[PDB]
């Protein structure tokens, strides 16, 4: 929803943002026809 | 150490103008231009040439150079002559020189005081293929255009007029410089329209549009073929230094063969063809081998007309065609027997 804080006018709409890749049943992706895996990354935990 | 930060700091050293200060500089600039017109009339001298001499003396000795349109080379000798000619004017005429000088001075100041305006407009155009400083400099160019065209009488503040010209300058720069393969500004406009259109269609259709759907949305004159051709023309090159792999070890260009330079096999083959051709031409008479060499360009590289080969051997244009035909006839006969030249026909 777009709002004009001065006027109060409100126009609301559902906008299309493109596509997001879906994971298949086995935990992989199909990207341009080829099956891909996203490998987990170990790193330093945030904190003090 | 940071060129943007430095420029911003330099920008911050010229105070912004009061409405009064702005009108004063704008007023002096307009008046200075009217003065240059008058000096042209009085002297019968080029107004542009006059403007460069006036401008040369205001900016100082630092900047003195030839201007592409001026007929005379602009150097201290010539600018002294013309400046001395202007100072040789009567008082009521010589006053316009003083007016013009102060006009150029005010032009400088007016430009300098508005530089932060260009920055605030340019920052919005980043990411379109021009660097921030580049956008600032083209934007500055528009600011200069605005100062020359500004009419202070209209009572509009300067920022209003400048903003149009600055936006214009930045957009022209992006249209002119952003592509390795340069595209005419109008064609860039057409390409961008097609982008917006396709984006509208994808925003209403929930998927990328086909070529035909884009063609409807573009109206008459547009079919699917033209949408495709326009997109083809709009393709930007990709770097030869584009990485292959997750190591830094290889480039995309390393995988691209060279089709221009002949391969060893091709060079060898062409050489063998020349040697077999000479072998077949030795089985003719020297004259009928020479007629063919002269007619097909093997000698000197050019193909001679029958009139030229005939005049060179002392025979008639019909005669040289005849000795050429019997040469070629003998050539065809020897080939069917020995089959030497067949394999080079691929």
């Amino acid at each position: 929803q777009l709002i004009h804080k001065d006027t109060g006018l409100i126009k609301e709409d559902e906008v299309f943002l493109g596509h997001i890749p879906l994971m298949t049943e086995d935990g992989s992706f199909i990207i341009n026809g080829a099956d891909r895996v996203i490998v987990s990354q170990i790193h330093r935990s945030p904190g003090v | 150490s940071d060129p943007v930060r430095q420029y911003l700091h330099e920008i911050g050293q010229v105070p912004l103008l009061t409405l009064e200060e702005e009108v004063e500089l704008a007023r002096k600039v307009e008046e200075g231009m009217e003065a240059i017109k008058k000096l042209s009339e009085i002297t019968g001298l080029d107004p542009d040439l006059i403007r460069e001499v006036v401008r040369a003396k205001i900016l100082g000795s630092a900047r003195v150079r030839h201007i592409p349109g001026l007929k005379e080379t602009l150097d201290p000798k010539t600018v002294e002559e013309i400046d001395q000619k202007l100072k040789s004017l009567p008082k009521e005429h010589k006053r316009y020189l003083h007016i013009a000088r102060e006009g150029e001075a005010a032009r400088q100041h007016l430009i300098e005081a508005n530089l932060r305006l260009v920055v605030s407009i340019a920052k919005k155009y980043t990411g379109r293929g021009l660097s921030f400083l580049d956008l600032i400099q083209e934007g500055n160019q528009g600011l200069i255009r605005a100062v020359e065209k500004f009419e202070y009488k209209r009572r509009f503040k300067f920022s209003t007029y400048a903003t149009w010209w600055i936006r214009q300058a930045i957009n022209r720069a992006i249209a002119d410089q952003a592509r390795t393969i340069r595209i005419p500004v109008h064609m860039v406009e057409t390409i961008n329209k097609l982008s917006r259109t396709a984006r509208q269609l994808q925003q209403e259709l929930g998927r990328e549009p086909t070529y035909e759907e884009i063609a409807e949305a573009m109206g008459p004159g547009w079919d699917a073929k033209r949408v495709e051709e326009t997109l083809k023309i709009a393709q930007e090159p990709v770097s030869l230094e584009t990485p292959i792999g997750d190591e830094k070890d290889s480039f995309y260009g390393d995988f691209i063969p060279d089709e221009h330079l002949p391969s060893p096999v091709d060079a060898a083959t062409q050489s063998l063809l020349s040697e077999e051709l000479e072998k077949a031409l030795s089985k003719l008479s020297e004259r009928e081998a020479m007629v063919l060499k002269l007619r097909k360009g093997l000698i000197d590289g050019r193909e001679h007309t029958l009139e030229e080969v005939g005049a060179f051997f002392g025979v008639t244009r019909e005669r040289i065609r005849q000795i050429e035909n019997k040469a070629l006839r003998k050539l065809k006969y020897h080939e069917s027997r020995t089959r030497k030249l067949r394999d080079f026909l691929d």
């Binding site: - | 070529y211 083809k232 062409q270 063809l273 051709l277 360009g297 050539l331 080939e335 030249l341 067949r342």
Partner: protein, 98 residues
């Protein structure tokens, strides 16, 4: 005709054919880049009396060391239902060799 034996009407190798290195998988012609034939070719063409063709053989062949039985072919042209290729591409052929 020995070279073209296993190609169908459209130029794609037939399903079930055995392909070996050097064999044509998909036949293709490309228009010759404009060039002036060397005087050797001028003389050769003149000797044999055969026009140099406008097109060259760009056909896809089995690379060295590869080959097998053709189990599938996919052909996608431009202007046929459901398929749109990247700009400039008239048609795409895929040959699956097992």
């Amino acid at each position: 005709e020995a070279a073209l034996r296993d190609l169908d009407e459209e130029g794609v190798v037939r399903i079930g054919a055995e392909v070996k290195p050097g064999d044509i998988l998909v036949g293709r012609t490309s228009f010759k880049g404009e060039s002036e034939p060397t005087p050797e070719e001028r003389l050769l063409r003149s000797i044999f009396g055969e026009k140099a063709r406008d097109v060259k053989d760009t056909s896809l062949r089995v690379p060295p060391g590869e080959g097998g039985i053709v189990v599938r072919t996919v052909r996608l042209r431009r202007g046929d239902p459901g398929v749109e290729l990247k700009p400039g591409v008239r048609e795409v052929v895929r040959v699956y060799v097992a």
